[PDB]
């Protein structure tokens, strides 16, 4: 297991535009196109992301290509974030992937406000962090996925995904 398989499991793969759990237009492996309620807007952002007139449908290769860029982007966002980098650098490899998953889902922003959980993680106080992470909108809206990520931080293993 790795970050890619892990996220492909959390996000799924869809080749036509769809709405995510928050009602936003998305495509591929969790690639958010826009927060706008406009489908046209969405179709426009997609064609710009892909570089062709897609008509709201992409191929598998294209989806995987967006996915790689998004993963790369998430990592780099972490490395550039002063609040997050030190946490990330402090973690083992399995736990790093859990932090990337959260950023990929919620953005640097979103995560960068789990201040308290982040300190706990940096301290390697796993059970405590796991409890603090659950006190969130994130957990309450997507509990199953949140639990998988939270178990990963708690244990440092991939058991939740096997
Ligand atoms: Cl893009
Ligand atoms: Cl979920």
Swiss-Prot record:
Q: What's a single GO CC term here? A: host cell cytoplasm
Q: Name one Pfam family in it.
A: Phage_lysozyme
Q: Which gene encodes it?
A: E
Coiled-coil annotation: which residues?
A: none
Q: Which reaction does it catalyse?
A: Hydrolysis of (1->4)-beta-linkages between N-acetylmuramic acid and N-acetyl-D-glucosamine residues in a peptidoglycan and between N-acetyl-D-glucosamine residues in chitodextrins
Question: According to the UniProt record heading this chain, what is the dependence of activity on pH?
Answer: Optimum pH is 7.3.
Residue numbers binding substrate: 32, 104, 117, 132
Q: What does this protein do?
A: Endolysin with lysozyme activity that degrades host peptidoglycans and participates with the holin and spanin proteins in the sequential events which lead to the programmed host cell lysis releasing the mature viral particles. Once the holin has permeabilized the host cell membrane, the endolysin can reach the periplasm and break down the peptidoglycan layer.
Instruction: State the top-level EC class.
Output: hydrolase
Which keywords has UniProt assigned to this entry?
A: Antimicrobial, Bacteriolytic enzyme, Cytolysis, Glycosidase, Host cell lysis by virus, Host cytoplasm, Hydrolase, Viral release from host cell
Q: Where is the protein localized?
A: Host cytoplasm
| Xref: SUPFAM superfamilies | Lysozyme-like
Q: Which residues are responsible for catalysis?
A: 11, 20
E.C. number: 3.2.1.17
**Name assigned to this protein:** Endolysin
Q: What induces it?
A: Expressed late in the viral replication.
The Gene Ontology terms for molecular function here are:
lysozyme activity
Q: Any keyword Zinc-finger?
A: no
Q: HAMAP family, per this entry?
A: ENDOLYSIN_T4 (MF_04110)
The family line of this record is: Belongs to the glycosyl hydrolase 24 family.
Substituting residue 11 to N results in: Loss of 84% of enzymatic activity
């Amino acid at each position: 297991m790795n970050i890619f398989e892990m996220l492909r499991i959390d996000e799924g793969l869809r080749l036509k535009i769809y709405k995510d759990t928050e009602g936003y237009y998305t495509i591929g492996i969790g690639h958010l196109l826009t927060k706008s309620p406009s489908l046209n807007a969405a179709k426009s952002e997609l064609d710009k992301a892909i570089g062709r007139n897609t008509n709201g449908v992409i191929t598998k290769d294209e989806a995987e290509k967006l996915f790689n860029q998004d993963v790369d982007a998430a990592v780099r966002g972490i490395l550039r974030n002063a609040k997050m980098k030190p946490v990330y650098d402090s973690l083992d490899a399995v736990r790093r992937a859990a932090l990337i998953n959260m950023v990929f889902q919620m953005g640097e922003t979103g995560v960068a406000g789990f201040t308290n959980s982040l300190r706990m993680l940096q301290q390697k106080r796993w059970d405590e962090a796991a409890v603090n992470l659950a006190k969130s909108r994130w957990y309450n809206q997507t509990p199953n996925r949140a639990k998988r990520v939270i178990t990963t931080f708690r244990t440092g293993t991939w058991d939740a995904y096997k």
